[PDB]
Structure 1
Amino acid sequence: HSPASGRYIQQMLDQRCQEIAAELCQSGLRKMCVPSSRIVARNAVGITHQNTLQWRCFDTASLLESNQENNGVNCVDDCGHTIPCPGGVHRQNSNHATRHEILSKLVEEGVQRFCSPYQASANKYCNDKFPGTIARRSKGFGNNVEVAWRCYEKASLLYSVYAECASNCGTTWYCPGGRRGTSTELDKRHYTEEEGIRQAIGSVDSPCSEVEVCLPKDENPPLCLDESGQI
């Protein structure tokens, strides 16, 4: 068991999308008659004139290997933030079903189960200061070694790259959505906030008593074990 996000919200969205595709197939929608391996949930633009980010059930066979670059697809972390995932929408040829309401509801429900209150606090600090940003302890511009707590514009993160985030005990954890420390323009889109983010994390009340040891888990609540006596 790794100290890492299980990406449980994304898993649930993919499974729900697999069920929806199967239901559309039964309704006669031929292009939705596929094995489950072909269907994922992504938050993205759609076909032409579908220009808002919405939760949609995509056939992966219709996705483009690259985006360029307003047509990227986004996956979701376990605190419900959308982050760039591999691939792009084909604006003419996409095979998808927009299901924004049900998929958004599943995200909201999942956040309660899976989002570390310590991470939620760090994310809130960042969004309050820099709207749209989330917290990670990760790389900056043109330095692929140094990590620091920063408020990152979500578009600058990579879902396939894990980066440090706060566990539900306020201890080291790793979450999808990280930086490579490359030197692209996107690599600039962050605001380093060591003091403010650490304070946000430090301000969270423990799920355990002062007489218990917090052992973090990939779901809330963490384990609170009775502290060992002067045995």
Structure 2
Amino acid sequence: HSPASGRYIQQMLDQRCQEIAAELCQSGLRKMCVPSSRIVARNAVGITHQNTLQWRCFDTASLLESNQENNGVNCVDDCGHTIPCPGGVHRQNSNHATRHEILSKLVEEGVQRFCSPYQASANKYCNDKFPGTIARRSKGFGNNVEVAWRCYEKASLLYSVYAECASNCGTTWYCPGGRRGTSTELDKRHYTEEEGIRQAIGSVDSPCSEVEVCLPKDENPPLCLDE
């Protein structure tokens, strides 16, 4: 038991994608006849002219190892935010199936199960003030030690880096989507908001009596135990 996100929403999406690829193969779509290990859900551009971000089922053998632009893939955290993860879309050769409605719907279901009400408030404060940002306690520009609560632009985060977030008791937790504190242009795309985020976090109602002890969990609700 790590005090860390289980990435359950992403996990559902990949599984649902594996099912869809299997169905398509049964329908004769030869390129979709692959083992499960080869299919994931990414939120990304598609082939040329498929220029918006959509949930699609990708064959990982058709993914590039890195991106240039505007072709990076995104994964999703347990609050429903899409965050860069490794890989890139080959705009001519991608093997995928766009499944935007089914996959979006599973995200919305997964948000009710898995998203910490304390993290949701931290994210709401961030999005209200700086549209498209979410809250982490992580690194800033050109400094790989110091952490602070900030509103980060999602494109500047890395899914494969875990960074501090709020658990569903408003305590220390770690979530995919963090910073390395390197010195790139993306490493500047955040707004430090220690007081605002902390007060957003502080303003959420406890899921436990003032007399119970809240033990966080990677799914809602947390454990409440008598003091």
Q: Do both proteins adopt the same fold according to a TM-score greater than 0.5, normalized to the shorter chain?
A: yes
Give deviations 1:75-111, integer Å, cap 9, x for gaps: 0000000000000000000000000000000000000
CA–CA distance in structure 1, aligned partners of residues 23 and 62 of structure 2: 19
Give deviations 1:145-167, integer Å, cap 9, x for gaps: 00000000000000000000000
CA–CA distance in structure 2, aligned partners of residues 155 and 186 of structure 1: 8
Q: Percent identity?
A: 100
CA–CA distance in structure 2, aligned partners of residues 210 and 188 of structure 1: 40
CA–CA distance in structure 2, aligned partners of residues 19 and 128 of structure 1: 37
| Structure-2-length-normalised TM-score | 1.00
- The answer to whether the aligner puts 1:29 opposite 2:29 as a matched pair is yes
Aligned to 1:12: 12
Give deviations 1:35-80, integer Å, cap 9, x for gaps: 0000000000000000000000000000000100210000000000
CA–CA distance in structure 1, aligned partners of residues 99 and 69 of structure 2: 23
Q: Secondary structure at the match of 2:15?
A: helix
Aligned length in residues: 227
CA–CA distance in structure 2, aligned partners of residues 12 and 163 of structure 1: 22
Aligned to 2:172: 172
Aligned to 1:108: 108
- RMSD of aligned C-alpha atoms? 0.3
Structure 1 segments of 4+ aligned residues over 4 angstroms from their partners: none
CA–CA distance in structure 1, aligned partners of residues 20 and 13 of structure 2: 10
CA–CA distance in structure 2, aligned partners of residues 212 and 4 of structure 1: 23
CA–CA distance in structure 1, aligned partners of residues 216 and 225 of structure 2: 11
CA–CA distance in structure 1, aligned partners of residues 28 and 20 of structure 2: 13
Give deviations 1:118-155, integer Å, cap 9, x for gaps: 00000000000000000000000000000000000000
| Structure-1-length-normalised TM-score | 0.98
